[PDB]
Amino acid sequence: QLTEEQIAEFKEAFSLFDKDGDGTITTKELGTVMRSLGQNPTEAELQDMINEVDADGNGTIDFPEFLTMMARKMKDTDSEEEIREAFRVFDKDGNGYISAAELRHVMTNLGEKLTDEEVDEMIREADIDGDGQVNYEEFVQMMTA
Template sequence: MFICSRVSYFISITSLEELDKLCKRKGKIDAKDLITVMRSLGTCPTYSEVDRHLQVHKIDKTGELDFSTFLTMMHRQMQQEDPKTEILEAMRMTDKHKKGYILASELRAKLTGLGEKLTDKEVDELFKEANVGPDGLIHYEEFTKMVTLPPVDY
């Protein structure tokens, strides 16, 4: 649906340093692996967005890119992604009466039945974290703030 499976939309320096170590084997990332690497680091690029990144840097789909070029691509991808706006737009489209809330049962049906499907347990955990009340209503402005907070770092 509208939530990428990667919960964290914030990429830590540690993650990028780990990726840099992986690239040290040959110092390059294969262009064919770019979408996988970008998604594993928390972004949600489409195939056409990845193709556009490669075209901008004049890299063939069978080519390779260095770490510096990869960082530039990741930076651009992160700038164009805005999970709060995407989630709010999806919630507003679901709110046919424009009241500022949707039924938890309606959101559950979408999260477990569309796109990258969540399990009922995952939805229960999400609702618990976002403080969905017993009235079964999800006030989506507040809900969006809760689900897009950075994860707690202990």
């Protein structure tokens, strides 16, 4: 039921996770990402974290494995918390509105260089209510979509 699209979205997310084109995401790589997004967990934490997802995998997450997590295993509460968390991860300001520049802040963090207008467009494409901001309601509506 995950569409060709959805599977593809999970795949590009897996790409954003691994800088090396390893075909795997290492404990170190995840880390580079979490710190990229500002959550700096213990190298040990990471080991456990990659372990919870894989259990064999020697500290590397794989994509077939990755999708397994990104498929909505999440409970409404569980996802809700998460959906919320990302949203915060999105707003360093924590103002509660998604800056076009804030989107850039995240990408810049994930090392993807994308056009400035395109970014505005990214929000604009998805933006009706928040002209220039994606409201959280927009975010949740969007994720399910």
